[PDB]
Each structure stands twice: as structure tokens, then as C-alpha cells.
Amino acid sequence: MISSLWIAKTGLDAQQTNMDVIANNLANVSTNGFKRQRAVFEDLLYQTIRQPGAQSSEQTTLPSGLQIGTGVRPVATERLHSQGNLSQTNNSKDVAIKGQGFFQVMLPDGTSAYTRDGSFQVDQNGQLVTAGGFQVQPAITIPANALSITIGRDGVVSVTQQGQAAPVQVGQLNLTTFMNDTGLESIGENLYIETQSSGAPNESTPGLNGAGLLYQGYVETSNVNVAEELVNMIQVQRAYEINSKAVSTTDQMLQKLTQL
Amino acid sequence: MISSLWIAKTGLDAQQTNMDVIANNLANVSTNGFKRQRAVFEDLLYQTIRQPGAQSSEQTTLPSGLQIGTGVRPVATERLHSQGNLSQTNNSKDVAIKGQGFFQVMLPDGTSAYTRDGSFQVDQNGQLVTAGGFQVQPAITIPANALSITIGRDGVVSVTQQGQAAPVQVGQLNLTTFMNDTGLESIGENLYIETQSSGAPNESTPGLNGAGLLYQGYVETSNVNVAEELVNMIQVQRAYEINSKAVSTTDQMLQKLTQL
Amino acid sequence: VMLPDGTSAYTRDGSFQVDQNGQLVTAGGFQVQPAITIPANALSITIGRDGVVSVTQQGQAAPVQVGQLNLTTFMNDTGLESIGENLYIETQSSGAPNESTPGL
Amino acid sequence: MISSLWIAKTGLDAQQTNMDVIANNLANVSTNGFKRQRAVFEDLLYQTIRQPGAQSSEQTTLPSGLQIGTGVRPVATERLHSQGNLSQTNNSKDVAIKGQGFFQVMLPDGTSAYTRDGSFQVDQNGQLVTAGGFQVQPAITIPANALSITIGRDGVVSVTQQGQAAPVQVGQLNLTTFMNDTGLESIGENLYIETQSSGAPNESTPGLNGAGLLYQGYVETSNVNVAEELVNMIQVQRAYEINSKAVSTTDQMLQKLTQL
Amino acid sequence: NGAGLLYQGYVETSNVNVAEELVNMIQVQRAYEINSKAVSTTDQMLQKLTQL
Amino acid sequence: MISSLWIAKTGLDAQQTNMDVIANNLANVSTNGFKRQRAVFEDLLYQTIRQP
């Protein structure tokens, strides 16, 4: 029931949130197209007993007042929208985007979400859907009897057929770019939905207006650096132990006070 | 216990599944007509403590909120129906299928399954049967006084007979195609059965509708590569060992918190 | 916070819940005076530092404003008479409460 | 004699039972045809001081009443009737069953029991008995001068003899399944008996009516995964520590009360 | 209509934060001890008064 | 003196018997006309709290 105890509780909770985000970053180290997160902490208010700059006398002004902090709180968990390393998989329907942008996906309830994990497949109706059953927005259809599917540098998906002697331009595969990519609200299954912090998307073809380029046969791995999470965990453990020590010291102080 | 512990447990489970699929791909490297497996991961939901784009004031809005992941989940582990290299066995009853297609066989209970591993024997009744005691759906029956069996580019099976000095068309060897070959489920002895994920089986003759050709005396080997399997094994081992560190750190933090 | 008797008491403890009709009430059933109402199927409700309250709904991106949360200031809060259940009522020893937006 | 103390005692008992089931799963990790168990927990009754939704005044209704929990009690231990990993031993009489269903045996007193572990032997008279002397229900008898006995994919069992050429069939290994296999009451030596929760057993040949298949020379190992048992033990130990700390705090406060 | 989704093969665990429970227990124990000391002080005061 | 301890003791004894069988089989690998051993286990009794 003491200010020191409450400050230490806030510190413990902040360290717990830091450890949680580190564990989440480590867990999906092998998730294609994953972007890591880091949490920023901002301290709480200050109780002022003696106001700084107080007019202590007719001329004397206090160089600094008496202020006591009230703890620390987590304010945001920002995503680091960096570029992950590309890999080789030698697959017809594995597309990795380089640069900036997002594929559009039509959710079952009629809304539109945005994704980054490009690993496509075909359903029983020929539609080009992602892993999870959600289909793309431009509604790309792959006819039967097809031999191979080629996606160029830009989104001109073409199908090599048996008796046409030339590929057929099935459709166009654009992507949407935001000006506040870190502001997107994330949901499960590697889908981002547009929010107010993120601006209105402006869909464009690859290679224009700063948009990225599509590559076939590549998969964008998670941009998680394992070599730094170990150091982060060590620092987190030390901070948690220190705060627990502070709590124990406060409790012992109170016990010695009340044993009289 | 704690969210960090649960996240690390989910990560451990995902890495264990990845290791298992790698081991299964590596074990049956020499199985003829084997398509390797690849597992795709996907992150779970997110707890939104602070909503992104929150309206803190009438003019200022939060650029990024507070979201904590709930771990990772294995969405699917699917088989890569790529093309495998061929080898010569100089066997009259061995056929290898090039391109896209599936032989059809009939299980004893009545249902029909689809295979890629072409290695046919003959039962005591003269009926064409694959390795495992399963007959081909067209039910080709090789008669007696058979000298040599010829299987051309298409599905024509003929036998050179000493009598009548003329080959006789024993039967036709059709094959089927699925517009979604990925969705086929897998059972033992190199069998696949139709599911709702895959379309209706479009049956045809070789060389038409995009179906692949047939080669006499060849066999389609597995599409596994030990060189990439080993490096993937190293990756998964390091990822699992890193994930275990999060569990250990959480346990130590809980112990220190308890020992106050 | 408005009592059943109709008098507007003033409280400091913030622990608010939502009753069946979607109104924002404190623990005890007493309702806040600006009469903040929360619609059904609300995903997340966020209260800004300025004083506004917004509700997020599935389907649309722009948050919908549901009400404004002003608060009162007294010239002498010591003279407020403390009735039970964490309520202070205005007396003659305290100046007339003035309502204002938070932070101003 | 305090509600907190009784709640903590119930929590300790629940954690003890969880540790017991974990240790039981770990102990018989090398038992053929064994299924893991998992406990399910529910909270006890809540004693209500003020009824939720109470009509506080003519208009005011309490948003949430005052309720105090009583604790947690275990409800059931579900057996995960998954598919065990198949091993190989190259034995004539070791038979594994893939899928569903159980072999039916007769207990000495006359009742009928069911088992999943297939590891058969032969008694003096030549009757096929399990490991323990119990004989299978169809009463399969192995004749003398038996060179080798074979069990096909279905339930047909034959044996070759020197004096003939075509093997002579002996019996049929029909297996029975249940509507709900989770509700089987288990007893020692891998035997399950029919109960009210489990439906009426229905017999069928292997490979029909959703039943499994018989593989000769294989034994179905237990489906116990040692990977997560360690983390379960860590979690249960920490939970026991937390509840013990709760008891300690209650004792400390009660002693400080009665000290005066 | 803002309803949840269904996932198969998973179970929703209890959302109990163990970290805060220990410090809450410490607070509860200290508050209980302080109130007990207040009761003892009142008892001592009454005992001194009664033997007047 | 607890159920988990007794279950773990039984498990340890089973593993020790399995190891002894393996060691004995490996010891005489060059013995003419020798047959390997194989130990089979089965779960012990069950104590019921709520009847299935």
C-alpha cells in the first residue's frame, strides 16, 4: 500500500510485457513474411511536492523542485517493417514481393484485408487463393489443363497451355501500398486490416509509385534476428530480478516497521 | 501460466512439427514416386490492449496501438507435386508418367484411388496390378502366349503374339488430372483419394488436355534433396534450441518472483 | 454522477461498467451525467485523453463517436460533503461546480 | 478454517492430480497400444452475497453482484484415442491395427473385453491367445506342423503346410468398434470393457464400416509424446508452488491475527 | 455481427496473470497486519481505561 | 510416499528391466544358436474416482 510498492508493480508489469513481445518474436521465427515487434515504454506522472522554479523568496527561485515519479507504462508495440531475406523454393505458385506493398484479400464477410505472406495455391474452382481459403481481390482464375503458370516481374500472370503456342494473359495482379505501414492493425493468419492510423490504400501495379516487384519461386522469410533476442532476454531477466529485489526490500522495510 | 510460456510452447510445437516433416521427407528418399512435404506456419490472434488509430484527441490519433501476439499455428503441411527425375530399369511392366497426371486404381472395398508410382505386376489371373495387390481401373488383362508388351506414347497396351503374327490391342491406359492436386490427401502405399479440396477427376488419354506422356521401362523417383534437407535440419534445430531458452527464462523469472 | 434522487453527486474513483441498456454506469448502477451510450456488438471502446469516447465496429474502419465526457471542477473541493459509496455532494462551503472538457 | 485456506487446499489437490496423470502418462511410455490421458478442470460453486442484477432501487440495477468462488475440482480424464506410431519387428504373430476398432477377448470369468495392443502368442492347444493367456473371441486355432502362418490385409488368417501347396485358411480376425471409444472403462493389462457411455459394440471385417486394417509384423507403440511432458511438469510444479505460497500467506495472516 | 470465430484443436486457457497475484498477496498481508495492530491498539486503550 | 512417486518408481523399474534385456542381448551376439529376448509391458491397475 506504498508508493514504492506500486512503482515496483508497474516496473514488473512493464518487464513482463517486454518479455512477452520478445517471446512472440522468437516463436514465429520461421513464419514466411513475418515482421518483428518492439515495445516502447513511457513513464507515468510525477507528484510535485515543491514546484520547480518556485518563488522561494523575493528573488530566490528554486533551481529544481521536488518531484516523485509514479512508475512506467507501455505506450506502443511498434512493428519494424523491414525487408526479410528471400529464399529459393522452386514452386510455380510461390510469389515473394521485394520493396513495399501488400496483396489484397477478400474476407468471407465481404471486407478486404491486406497480407504479405505470398504462398498461393488453387482451390477446386480454379481461383487463386492463399493458405487459408481466402481468395485474392482481382479474382484470378486458373483454367484446367494448364501446364505452367508464369508471373513476370510485374503482375502479368500468364498460363502456358498445350495447344495455343503462346501464353494467355489471364489477368493482372496489383498490390496496395500505405504511407503508414507500421500503423496497420494486425489480425490472425498473417492478415492486416485498414484502420484510421493507416492511410487509404492506393492500389498500383508493381514497379510504379515506389511499389515492389514480384518474384516467382521465392518466399520472404520472417525478418527476425535471433542473435539479438538472446541478449534481450538476458537484459529482461536481470531487470525482472532487480525489480523483484526492490519489492522484497519494500516488504522487509514494512515488516520491520510493523513489528514494533 | 504466463503468456510468454504459452507462446514459447506453441513455438516449440511448431518447430517439432517442422522437424517431423523434415525427418519424414528425408527417411523415404529412395521411395519411387514420392513427393516431398512442406509445412507453412501462421501466427495466431493478437490481444489488442490499445486500439491502433485510437482517437486520443479531436485532432491527434495514435499511430500505432498496443498488440501482443498469441503465438503461431501450423496452418497446413502440404505435398509438393513437382516433377521428379526419371531412371531406367529395363522392365517391361514399368511405366513412368511425365508431366501432369495420375494412374487410377480400385481398392477392394470399391472406391478408387490415384497414384503416381508406376510399377505394375501381374496376378495369377493375368490382370494388371500395381505393387500392393491393387488392379488398375480399366482392368487390363494380359493373356497367355505373351512375348513382349508394348506401351506407346499414349495409353495403348499391345502384346506381341506368336500366333496370328499380329499385335492385338489389349486395352487402353487412361489417366486422370485434378485442377487442385495439392489438396489431395495422402494414405499409405503411394495412394491418393479425392477430397472436396480437389476438383472432380478429369480423366483422359496421354498427350491430351495437358496430361503427361507415358514412358516404357522408366520409373519416377522421389523429389527429395538431402542437400537442402540437411541445412533445413540445422535451421530447425537451432530454432528449437532458441525457443527452449524462452521457457527456461520464464521459469527462472517465476522462481525469482516466488522466492521473495 | 446522477443519483436516483435526481441530485448530481461528484466522484473521483473511475471504475465504470455497462448496464443492459448500453449506458455507462459506475459500480452501483448510478449513471454518468453526460449520458454516454455504447451500442451493441462493440469490438473495442477507447477513451482519449481529451475526453472523447469512441467505439470500433466490425466492417467499417472509421471509429464512431458515441459521446463526450466532460468533468467538473470546484473552487474549494475540501468543503464538498462526502456521502457514502464514494460520492461527494456540493455544499455552500464549496463554489458552484464548473463543467469543462478535460485538459482545458 | 478459512475460505481462502479451503480454496488453496482444493487447488493443491487439483495440481496433485494433474501431476499424477502426467507421471502415469510418462511411466508407460513403452507400452504397445497405449493412449495418453488429459484432465479437465471446472470451478466449484460460487457463494453469492449480493445477487447479480439486484434491484438496488426503483430504477438502479446492480451491473454485477458479489460472488466468492469455492475452488476447482477435476471433472474427467479424457483418453486421446489418436493413432500410435507403427514400429517394425519382423515377427509372424505380432499384428498391428491401423485405424479404429479393438480385438475382442474373453475374460476367464466369461465376460467379454476389448484391447488395442496386438502381440499374440500360442497356447499348448494351438489357440491364439494374447500376452496373458486370454484367447481371442473368434477362437482361432493353429494346427500342428505349421510351417508359417500369415495374416492378410483384411481379417483372413491362413497357414501353409508341408503336405499341401495352396495354403489352408483357418479363421477370421473380425474386429469390433464402438460409437464412442473415449467412454470405455479401462482396467489393467490394456483391456477395456463396455460401459453405458460407450455404445453397443459392432463387429466388422477390417477395412469396412470405417474400421482399420491389419499389418503383420508391426506393433502399435504408445502415442505418448515426451516433448511437452517436460513443460507440463514445469508448469504444474510452478502452480503447486503458487498454491503453497497462498497457504503460507493465509497462515501468516491468521497467526498475526491470533497473536494479539 | 461482431461475433467470435471458431478454431478447432485449441482450448482457451484461463486469463489469470500470476505476476500480479504475488504482489497483491503481499499488499493483502500487510494491510491485514496493520488492521490487526489497530485492533490491538484499541484493545490496549480500553484496557487502560477500564482499570481506572 | 505419494502416488506420483510410486508410479515413477514402477516406470524406473520397467526401464531398468528393458536396459538389462538390451545389454544381455548385446553381450552374446556371437553365440551360436542364440535367440534374442523381447520384454513386453502393460499398464497396471486403475483407481476410479468418478465411474465412467
From Swiss-Prot, chain C:
It comes from the Bacteria. It is found in: Bacterial flagellum basal body. The basal body constitutes a major portion of the flagellar organelle and consists of four rings (L,P,S, and M) mounted on a central rod. The rod consists of about 26 subunits of FlgG in the distal portion, and FlgB, FlgC and FlgF are thought to build up the proximal portion of the rod with about 6 subunits each. Belongs to the flagella basal body rod proteins family. This is Flagellar basal-body rod protein FlgG. The lineage of its organism: Bacteria, Pseudomonadati, Pseudomonadota, Gammaproteobacteria, Enterobacterales. The chain holds residues 105 to 208 of 260 of the full protein.
